[PDB]
Design a protein around this ligand. Structure first.
Ligand SMILES: Nc1ncnc2c1ncn2[C@@H]1O[C@H](COP(=O)(O)OP(=O)(O)OP(=O)(O)O)[C@@H](O)[C@H]1O
Ligand SMILES: [Mg+2]
Length: 244
């Protein structure tokens, strides 16, 4: 993982302590900030490192399909993500989009380690270390009535705050250089020719709403359009949709 900003190195240190626990971990951060890599690192540094690492984007699924995907369904049965994560770690992204029904059932699995079943089948016990992520303000959602406080009192054992790229200014050029160099290997340029000061200013003054994912994509496109090692990269193409 790239970066040397102090906020980021403190995140890695915090992860190294949290990983060995079985407690749930909440990661707060914007899109493209590295949340799922952190979750993965929590898994591989824990004692479950040999178990499954399963991830799910909650905002991708309608209420009934999310319900089925997390908790499974019958009526001979489709196992949900908690079953597939048994002995391992489940990463739930976009937690704040989960409907209240899902949030409440999630509380029950954290509390009582089991998934109940429709039918004459008895409830299913599961053993899963949970990591969840969002950018929302969950305390504020609790005030609004759109996120459950009972859930947050079990889910938020501790909180990993991943800083946005605009607050890791010192890692911007370091990461752009790394991504530029990988893109030079991909298009077979002999050497990355460097960034002009103008390119640097463009990179450093942009607020990066998509953070590191967006940085990578902008840098790759830019290197490709530049297309040579004979002079430094001057034109950073932030927005490829801009017209004529
Ligand atoms: N510290 C880092 N060093 C190297 N690559 C990174 C780093 N952080 C993020 N990335 C890369 O940037 C992209 C975004 O990372 P990732 O998907 O894990 O972020 P996220 O917060 O999970 O975002 P989202 O849910 O929007 O996908 C990926 O291409 C990933 O490899
Ligand atoms: Mg991702």
């Amino acid at each position: 993982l790239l970066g040397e900003a102090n906020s980021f190195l403190e995140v890695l240190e915090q992860v190294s302590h949290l990983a060995p626990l079985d407690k749930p971990v909440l990661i707060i951060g914007e899109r493209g900030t590295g949340k799922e890599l952190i979750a993965s690192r929590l898994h591989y540094l824990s004692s479950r490192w040999q178990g499954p690492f399963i991830s799910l984007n909650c905002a991708a699924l309608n209420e009934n399909l999310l319900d089925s995907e997390l908790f499974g369904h019958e009526a001979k049965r489709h196992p949900g993500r908690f079953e597939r994560a048994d002995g391992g770690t489940l990463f739930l992204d976009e937690l704040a989009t989960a409907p209240m029904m899902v949030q409440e059932k999630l509380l029950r699995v954290i509390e009582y380690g089991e998934l109940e079943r429709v039918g004459g089948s008895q409830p299913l016990q599961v053993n899963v270390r949970l990591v969840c992520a969002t950018n929302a303000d969950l305390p504020a959602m609790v005030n609004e009535g759109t996120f459950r406080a009972d859930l947050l009192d079990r889910l938020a054992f501790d909180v990993v705050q991943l800083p946005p790229l605009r607050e890791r200014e010192s890692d911007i050029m370091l990461m752009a250089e790394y991504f530029a160099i990988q893109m030079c290997r991909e298009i077979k340029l002999p050497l990355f020719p460097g960034f002009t000061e103008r390119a640097r200013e463009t990179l450093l003054n942009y607020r990066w709403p998509g953070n590191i994912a967006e940085l990578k994509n902008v840098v790759e496109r830019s290197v490709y359009r530049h297309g040579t090692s004979d002079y430094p990269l001057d034109d950073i193409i932030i927005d490829p949709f801009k017209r004529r």
